[PDB]
Amino acid sequence: ASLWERFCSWVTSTENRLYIGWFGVLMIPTLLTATSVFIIAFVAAPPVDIDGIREPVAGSLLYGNNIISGAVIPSSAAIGIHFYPIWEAASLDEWLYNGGCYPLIVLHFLLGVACYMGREWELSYRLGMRPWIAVAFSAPVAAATAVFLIYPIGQGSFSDGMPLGISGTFNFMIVFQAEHNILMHPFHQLGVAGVFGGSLFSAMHGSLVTSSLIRETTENESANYGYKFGQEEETYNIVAAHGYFGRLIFQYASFNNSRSLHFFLGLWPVVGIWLTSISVSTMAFNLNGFNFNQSVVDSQGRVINTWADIINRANLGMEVMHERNAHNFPLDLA
Amino acid sequence: FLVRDQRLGANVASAQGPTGLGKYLMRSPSGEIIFGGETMRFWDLRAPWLEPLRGPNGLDLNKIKNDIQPWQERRAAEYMTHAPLGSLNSVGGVATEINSVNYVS
Amino acid sequence: MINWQVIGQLVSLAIIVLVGPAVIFLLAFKKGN
Amino acid sequence: DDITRTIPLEASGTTITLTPEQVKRGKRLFNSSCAICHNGGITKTNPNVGLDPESLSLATPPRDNVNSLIDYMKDPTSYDGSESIAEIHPSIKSADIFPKMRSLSDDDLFAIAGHILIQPKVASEKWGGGKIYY
Amino acid sequence: AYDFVSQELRAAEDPEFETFYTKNILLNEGIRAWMAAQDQPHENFIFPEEVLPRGNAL
Amino acid sequence: RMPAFFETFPVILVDQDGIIRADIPFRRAESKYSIEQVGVTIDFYGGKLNGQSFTDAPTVKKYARKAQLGEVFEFDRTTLESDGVFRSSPRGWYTFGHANFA
Amino acid sequence: APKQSFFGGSSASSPFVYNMKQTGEILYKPLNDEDLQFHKNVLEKSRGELDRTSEQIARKSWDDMRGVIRNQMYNMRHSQLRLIESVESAEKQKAAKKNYNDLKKSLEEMDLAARNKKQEDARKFRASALKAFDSFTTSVG
Amino acid sequence: VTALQILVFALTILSTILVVSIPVILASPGQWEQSKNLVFTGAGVWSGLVIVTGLLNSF
Amino acid sequence: EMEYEGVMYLGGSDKIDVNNANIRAYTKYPGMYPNIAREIVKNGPFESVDDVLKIETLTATQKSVVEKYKNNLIALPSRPEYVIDKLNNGLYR
Amino acid sequence: FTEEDFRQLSYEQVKGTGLANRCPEVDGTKGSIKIEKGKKYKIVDMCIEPKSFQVEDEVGKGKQARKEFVDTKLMTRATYTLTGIEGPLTVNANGDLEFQEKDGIDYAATTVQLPGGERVPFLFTVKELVATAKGDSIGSGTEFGGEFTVPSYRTGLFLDPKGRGGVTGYDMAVALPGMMADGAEGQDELFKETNKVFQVTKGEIEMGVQKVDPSTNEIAGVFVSEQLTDTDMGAKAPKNILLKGVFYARIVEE
Amino acid sequence: ALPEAYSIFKPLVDILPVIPVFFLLLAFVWQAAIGFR
Amino acid sequence: VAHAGIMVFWCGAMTLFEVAHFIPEKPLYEQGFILLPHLATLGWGVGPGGEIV
Numbered sequence A: 001a002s003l004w005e006r007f008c009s010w011v012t013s014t015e016n017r018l019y020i021g022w023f024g025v026l027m028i029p030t031l032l033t034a035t036s037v038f039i040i041a042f043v044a045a046p047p048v049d050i051d052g053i054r055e056p057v058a059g060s061l062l063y064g065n066n067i068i069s070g071a072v073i074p075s076s077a078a079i080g081i082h083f084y085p086i087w088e089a090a091s092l093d094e095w096l097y098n099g100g101c102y103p104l105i106v107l108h109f110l111l112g113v114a115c116y117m118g119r120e121w122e123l124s125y126r127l128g129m130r131p132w133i134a135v136a137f138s139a140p141v142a143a144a145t146a147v148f149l150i151y152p153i154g155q156g157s158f159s160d161g162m163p164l165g166i167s168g169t170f171n172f173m174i175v176f177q178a179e180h181n182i183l184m185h186p187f188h189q190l191g192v193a194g195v196f197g198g199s200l201f202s203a204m205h206g207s208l209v210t211s212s213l214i215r216e217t218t219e220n221e222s223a224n225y226g227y228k229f230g231q232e233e234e235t236y237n238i239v240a241a242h243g244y245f246g247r248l249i250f251q252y253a254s255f256n257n258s259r260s261l262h263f264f265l266g267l268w269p270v271v272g273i274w275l276t277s278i279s280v281s282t283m284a285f286n287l288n289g290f291n292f293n294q295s296v297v298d299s300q301g302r303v304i305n306t307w308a309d310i311i312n313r314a315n316l317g318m319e320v321m322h323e324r325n326a327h328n329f330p331l332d333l334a
Numbered sequence B: 001f002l003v004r005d006q007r008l009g010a011n012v013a014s015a016q017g018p019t020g021l022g023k024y025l026m027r028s029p030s031g032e033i034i035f036g037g038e039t040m041r042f043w044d045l046r047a048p049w050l051e052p053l054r055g056p057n058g059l060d061l062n063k064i065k066n067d068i069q070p071w072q073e074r075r076a077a078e079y080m081t082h083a084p085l086g087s088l089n090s091v092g093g094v095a096t097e098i099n100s101v102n103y104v105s
Numbered sequence C: 001m002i003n004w005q006v007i008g009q010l011v012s013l014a015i016i017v018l019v020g021p022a023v024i025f026l027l028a029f030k031k032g033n
Numbered sequence D: 001d002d003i004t005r006t007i008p009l010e011a012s013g014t015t016i017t018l019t020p021e022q023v024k025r026g027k028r029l030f031n032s033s034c035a036i037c038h039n040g041g042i043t044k045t046n047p048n049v050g051l052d053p054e055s056l057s058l059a060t061p062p063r064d065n066v067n068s069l070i071d072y073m074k075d076p077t078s079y080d081g082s083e084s085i086a087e088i089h090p091s092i093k094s095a096d097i098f099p100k101m102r103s104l105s106d107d108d109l110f111a112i113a114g115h116i117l118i119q120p121k122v123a124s125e126k127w128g129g130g131k132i133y134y
Numbered sequence E: 001a002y003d004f005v006s007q008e009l010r011a012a013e014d015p016e017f018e019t020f021y022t023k024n025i026l027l028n029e030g031i032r033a034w035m036a037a038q039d040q041p042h043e044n045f046i047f048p049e050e051v052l053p054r055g056n057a058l
Numbered sequence F: 001r002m003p004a005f006f007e008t009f010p011v012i013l014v015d016q017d018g019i020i021r022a023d024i025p026f027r028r029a030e031s032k033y034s035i036e037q038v039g040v041t042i043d044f045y046g047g048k049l050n051g052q053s054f055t056d057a058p059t060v061k062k063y064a065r066k067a068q069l070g071e072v073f074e075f076d077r078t079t080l081e082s083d084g085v086f087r088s089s090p091r092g093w094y095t096f097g098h099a100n101f102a
Numbered sequence G: 001a002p003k004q005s006f007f008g009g010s011s012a013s014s015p016f017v018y019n020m021k022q023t024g025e026i027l028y029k030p031l032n033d034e035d036l037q038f039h040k041n042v043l044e045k046s047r048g049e050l051d052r053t054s055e056q057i058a059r060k061s062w063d064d065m066r067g068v069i070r071n072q073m074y075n076m077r078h079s080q081l082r083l084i085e086s087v088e089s090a091e092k093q094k095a096a097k098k099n100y101n102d103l104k105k106s107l108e109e110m111d112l113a114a115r116n117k118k119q120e121d122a123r124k125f126r127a128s129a130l131k132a133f134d135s136f137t138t139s140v141g
Numbered sequence H: 001v002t003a004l005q006i007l008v009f010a011l012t013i014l015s016t017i018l019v020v021s022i023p024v025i026l027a028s029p030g031q032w033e034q035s036k037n038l039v040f041t042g043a044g045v046w047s048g049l050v051i052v053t054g055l056l057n058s059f
Numbered sequence I: 001e002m003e004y005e006g007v008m009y010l011g012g013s014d015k016i017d018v019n020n021a022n023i024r025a026y027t028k029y030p031g032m033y034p035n036i037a038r039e040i041v042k043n044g045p046f047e048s049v050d051d052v053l054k055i056e057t058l059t060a061t062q063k064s065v066v067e068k069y070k071n072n073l074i075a076l077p078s079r080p081e082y083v084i085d086k087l088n089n090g091l092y093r
Numbered sequence J: 001f002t003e004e005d006f007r008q009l010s011y012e013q014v015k016g017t018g019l020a021n022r023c024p025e026v027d028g029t030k031g032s033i034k035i036e037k038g039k040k041y042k043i044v045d046m047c048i049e050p051k052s053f054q055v056e057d058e059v060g061k062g063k064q065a066r067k068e069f070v071d072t073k074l075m076t077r078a079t080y081t082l083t084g085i086e087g088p089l090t091v092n093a094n095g096d097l098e099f100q101e102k103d104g105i106d107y108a109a110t111t112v113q114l115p116g117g118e119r120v121p122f123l124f125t126v127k128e129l130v131a132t133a134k135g136d137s138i139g140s141g142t143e144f145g146g147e148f149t150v151p152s153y154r155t156g157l158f159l160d161p162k163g164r165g166g167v168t169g170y171d172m173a174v175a176l177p178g179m180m181a182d183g184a185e186g187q188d189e190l191f192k193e194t195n196k197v198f199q200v201t202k203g204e205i206e207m208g209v210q211k212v213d214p215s216t217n218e219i220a221g222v223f224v225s226e227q228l229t230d231t232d233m234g235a236k237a238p239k240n241i242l243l244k245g246v247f248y249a250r251i252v253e254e
Numbered sequence K: 001a002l003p004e005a006y007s008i009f010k011p012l013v014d015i016l017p018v019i020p021v022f023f024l025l026l027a028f029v030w031q032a033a034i035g036f037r
Numbered sequence L: 001v002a003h004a005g006i007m008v009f010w011c012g013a014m015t016l017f018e019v020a021h022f023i024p025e026k027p028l029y030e031q032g033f034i035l036l037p038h039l040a041t042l043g044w045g046v047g048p049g050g051e052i053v
């Protein structure tokens, strides 16, 4: 009945087409200015001095750059992790040369998915249900915090963060594995077992549902037309798909509780991407991966190479050739 | 390496570094005299072994040239080699170093 | 030439592992908990 | 293996035999007292003079023998014998400024300097070369 | 799908055109020239230290 | 010669034992042995340059980089407007189509 | 048969220091004549740097005189510690222990008058730390 | 002094009996209503022996 | 440049060629690197080979140490691309 | 904003504010500096700050039109001034009082942007400056002037985007190996973007004292500097640039 | 190192930080002995 | 307070674990010490220049 409560009951109303709740008062204007700067600086941004060595990199669609090469380039390394908005520049094109578009996208995108994560809580409150889909979105939000914010916090400049582009992510991965050895890190090792394991259990659980459907349908028409939406009964025998997979491996290697099965779908990729997002952030403070270089020695003391040395000859070759004229001293950030 | 090439007789300013910028001594974006190279991102460092060489406008080019007392070369050569860069099995290096030291900071 | 340290480090580890399931193993035996 | 650890003692070619214990004593003391600056014969803070078999021979006392390396850690000089680089390098003379040199004996300077000459005999291209031989 | 031939003609005909794709090609020649003496030892790649592509100062 | 697996290869010169003698180096400073240091001479035989031998150190490096491609040939490439990267044979295009269809 | 060892038996790969004790004498003497002369040598150097602070108080440039008390005189409290644990008697050691403590207290009050930009207050803390420096040197002999 | 050495060695012997037999005696169905100052005697001699080890460390 | 005829003098041989050679090319001769080759790269001999023996601010025992290796030095026309990185060169082991 | 007002500031209040590169004025007139013909002399602390970067561009380019210096905008940061360009002044040509270059931060690598979107980089330097002025007194007039050699922007060991360089680097477009496999008249000869030339050109300066002080604190005057820009190691033609800002110096008696 | 009276107990204080890992694993032993009720 | 006991029991057992492996020639950071730098910041045992006695 108040002049504010009539506004306060519109924001927290579930009658809208998209939910526009109190976390959506922050993520709608921040993502829309992380979209409007990303779309413009992918098409028509000028070349950006990323390294602070006065050699600009041209990553927008006007300057060549088919879309598996274009990127919103990160900031200048002379700027560093200094706060660089538009009003702290002498002009708007001087702001574009130092790569000001990268912190304007990535501080609004990170603040937008942090309030997407609260908005994913918020509709699970107004609809009256269990609220932990915000916890499952905390694995991509941390992983988008690890490559974009925490790796620029630990490693100095904002130029070490991931470029907003497709070929920039492949450049970010080769430079990372040169200096941090992420492939032999035991927490990235868990994350690819939650990425392959999560891709296994999607192809495993999604198979055993669709292979044990009860036929509420004809022969020639599509199978999906037999599940009327909002029905009460289950559309597949859980007891037959359990008796399938209890014959495949053995009887007690399979969940005939479908709630403990579906929790195991929400636990294996989400904990794995939680451990990847830690690993990139602990390698941001240079707690690197395992280093078994030159470990195997014979009785005379001659070095016998193992399989971690042939990784290292790759790791050294992408170490001397990344940042090919940005180094003046023999050790990399030591 | 500002010390070592000055001890080989270089004018350590007017370095003419490889990209055209300063190799040893450089200019900060706010206009201070800072160290050049990749270490220009860490230009806002206040450290007690170099702050006796900073004047009001950054690093003084006269105090660097003369009063560069050898306890600072002790602390620079120690802190360069004792960098926070390690491994999970405690190997000190730039992640491509052979193992002969157990040091993570 | 006897080591005398990892003898002492593992004879004290055997004391330590005989503490935690020496509370529970007597408590299972005596119906307490 | 490891039958010949026949490093030269001083000039004119008198040699010495190290023994197995003085080599495990040497490698464990070269590590964690030297090898944070000399990881495989390089010098990390002065890389154009290192622990090569060639570059140790081309000094004004040639340091390819153990008796000029015992005299090195007791009293260091520069690469041309003129100055005394002791306030920027750890030694027995400067063991007040460098606390790692405070406790080790003369008998394990022979073990440390036995390790500098053994390493080009078993790891010849890798010792003193940079990362190219890693 | 190694290279974009539109951008290799341009980067040879402009010595200030650079992208993350063009930085990704130089990282591949670091991998293929440093690992080759160790990965394929039957070929006997006896590359000296002056001819393999290093960057600057490291 | 560069093998088929590579795409860029350093132009190193070997004798009949495998040992290097000249390398046309990437780093000219403190290069221990180069094309003009050891002074290699090209003696062409057969073809268009039957008997043309020259010891000019800039012109030896030109036909040194080409001869790691296997054999030198004069190309007419103002006809199809050629771009300069090696294409693939119909032996290798058939096998891409047929081992992916199968 | 492989030569295997169980929890000791110091071969080339055994990571145990229950063997490998030191045999010879410690050839660094802990307080000899050569570095005690070097501690006297830096006391000639450090007294010239506190003498040099007076012209930078008059020039009112603070980051020189807040920096020149850390530039050469960083190894001053370490060398003043080594001189007072070198003397023989204990009742003369109290006289050197007290004015080393009255030096340190005087020195940082000059630093507190340096950050606050107090020219009239830093000139008395400079001269009080100066005569405490000369009171130190005839206390240690 | 080595008389301190056997004192703190007697502390680690007595606290090994204390850390096992205190939660056995509390969480039995009996043995707590009967033996409270069997624990507080053992806890008293443990806190007693620390004080005796404490000012003997000054000497 | 792409072609340079004086590349065999810059190290990896004898005949250092003092005008555009690096400071660490004098490491291969004993008694030569740290402070006696300070005055060979500073106030350099851009005249001839025997201009380096008539150079000043040397001790007379330093001038005799150059005389042991007089045939391991030439004088080339000074290229400006190598004079700039005469002291650092970006070349560490 | 003199020297004696600037040295009282702490580093914690100069850092970040853009005041650390501002070429400190003075406040003095009715003075002179006498330079004796026998005594030794040195300029020290010679801070030089430009303003209004202007690149000469053609407007007609056929006939009947000049090359008007179009005003640009600065593009890097506030990194552009020079600091501490000391050098000996006591040499005296049949009068003239010349000072040669000794050391200091001679150069500052900044880029400016023309109208049209093209960014020209240049190396604003005063390296090898030999500036003479008529007379023996210094103050309120007595314009110095001399030639400085700029070096090239990139050095010889600057690697390209494709790994080519002058001192280092590849000597062929190695990503186009079929163009290298031609034997006659097509063997990457189209590219002389490959042969990198470290070329060195010269620039002129002329500076007026415009104020003095008879004790120290020499000029806080103005300067006009004509100069070439970056040629990309001999790939594109350099433009002329005209800089006109404020320098400041200090003569000590040696 | 340790004080010279307590230097014999150096094998005792080498595994005493590992005891807070054992207190987490004691709760799984105590739950399994009662039968996870 | 059982759990507040095991926080203090870590601080008791780790600080005795740091000082058992002390080796006084090395600095604090070359041995992986994590609670002894917290006590040397408070000035217990630290001398001039950063060395501890």
Ligand code: CLA
Binding pocket: A113, A139, A140, A141, A143, A144, A146, A147, A172, A173, A174, A176, A177, A182, A183, A188, A191, A192, A195, A196, A273, A276, A277, A280
């Ligand atoms: C077979 C091999 C293999 C596999 C399976 C993986 C797998 C993985 N790697 Mg890995 N890697 C490999 C080889 C491999 N790698 C090799 C060989 C290298 C060395 C070159 C690396 C180097 C490497 C690095 C350096 C990193 C990884 C990372 C990762 C993880 C990426 C997925 C993730 O966490 O994103 C999680 C999801 C996101 C980040 C997306 C966030 C989504 C946000 C919240 C919203 C989306 C906005 C969007 C625009 C909206 C849509 C628009 C709408 C209109 C539809 C994953 C575990 C990364 C990692 O673990 O940390 C992040 C990482 O940093 N790898």
Ligand SMILES: CCCCCCCCCCCCCCCCCC(=O)OC[C@H](CO[C@@H]1O[C@H](CO)[C@H](O)[C@H](O)[C@H]1O)OC(=O)CCCCCCCCCCCCCCCCC
Binding pocket: C009, C010, C013, K014, K015, K018, K021, L021, L022, L031, L032
């Ligand atoms: C972020 C924090 C989150 C929590 C993380 C911590 C908990 C995670 C578990 C990690 C801890 C595992 C147990 C501790 C291992 C190290 C102990 C050690 O040996 O120190 C290793 C150290 C080595 O001592 C070294 O000495 C050197 C001196 O020359 C240096 O001073 C080194 O700094 C020093 O580390 O001491 C020992 O050698 C003790 C050996 C005693 C032998 C028995 C130890 C048994 C310990 C494991 C018992 C099983 C419990 C395992 C966990 C079970 C569940 C999987």
Ligand SMILES: CCCCCCCCCCCCCCCC(=O)OC[C@H](COP(=O)(O)OC[C@@H](O)CO)OC(=O)CCCCCCCCCCCCCCC
Binding pocket: A086, A090, A091, A092
């Ligand atoms: C809450 C509702 C707010 C209004 C609607 C939102 C409109 C969103 C606009 C699109 C984004 C534009 C991004 C700027 C893009 C950008 O970078 O602009 C930068 C632009 C460039 O400046 P110049 O480079 O020309 O600087 C001048 C110098 O170069 C001259 O030497 O600055 C402007 O011209 C002014 C633009 C802001 C003017 C805004 C109006 C100011 C009035 C404020 C009123 C406050 C009251 C509001 C009451 C609620």
Ligand code: HEM
Binding pocket: B077, B078, D029, D030, D033, D034, D037, D043, D045, D046, D049, D050, D059, D063, D069, D072, D073, D077, D078, D079, D080, D085, D088, D089, D090, D112, D113
């Ligand atoms: C066991 C200890 C050590 C040994 C045997 C050792 C050995 C040597 C030797 C023989 C030299 C050559 C001296 C010369 O030719 O003039 C040298 C040079 C050098 N060492 Fe060490 N070293 C030790 C410890 C260290 C440490 C810990 C550091 C790091 C602080 C260090 C830094 C240097 C430097 C900088 C040089 C080069 C000197 C120069 O440039 O003139 N040394 N070392």
Ligand SMILES: CC1=C(/C=C/C(C)=C/C=C/C(C)=C/C=C/C=C(C)/C=C/C=C(C)/C=C/C2=C(C)CCCC2(C)C)C(C)(C)CCC1
Binding pocket: H008, H011, H012, H015, H019, K006, K009, K012, K013, K023, K024, K026, K027, K030, L002, L003, L005, L006, L009, L016
């Ligand atoms: C003098 C000294 C010593 C000794 C010491 C001692 C003897 C101590 C004692 C100590 C002790 C004696 C301690 C104890 C502690 C304990 C604690 C701290 C506990 C805790 C507990 C808990 C935590 C529990 C929990 C739980 C519950 C409640 C129920 C169920 C579950 C669980 C199990 C989890 C030595 C020789 C070493 C050295 C020198 C010094």
Ligand SMILES: CC1=C(/C=C/C(C)=C/C=C\C(C)=C/C=C/C=C(C)/C=C\C=C(C)\C=C\C2=C(C)CCCC2(C)C)C(C)(C)CCC1
Binding pocket: C015, C016, C017, C019, C020, C021, H012, H015, H016, H017, H019, K016, K019, K022, K023, K025, K026, K028, K029, K032
């Ligand atoms: C101070 C001290 C002390 C104390 C100690 C303590 C306090 C202890 C505690 C505690 C403990 C020590 C505990 C224990 C634990 C144990 C163990 C032994 C571990 C583990 C186990 C396990 C791991 C198993 C598990 C399982 C089950 C059964 C169920 C499920 C499955 C599984 C397998 C998981 C004393 C007095 C002696 C003296 C000396 C020093």
Ligand code: OEX
Binding pocket: A051, A077, A155, A159, A160, A175, A179, A323, A326, A332, A333, B038
């Ligand atoms: O830029 Mn991107 O990045 Ca990973 O590092 Mn540090 O800064 Mn550069 O380096 Mn090596």
Ligand SMILES: [Cl-]
Binding pocket: A326, A327, A328, A329, B036, B037, B038, B039
């Ligand atoms: Cl650098």
Ligand SMILES: [Fe+3]
Binding pocket: A205, A206, A209
């Ligand atoms: Fe399902």
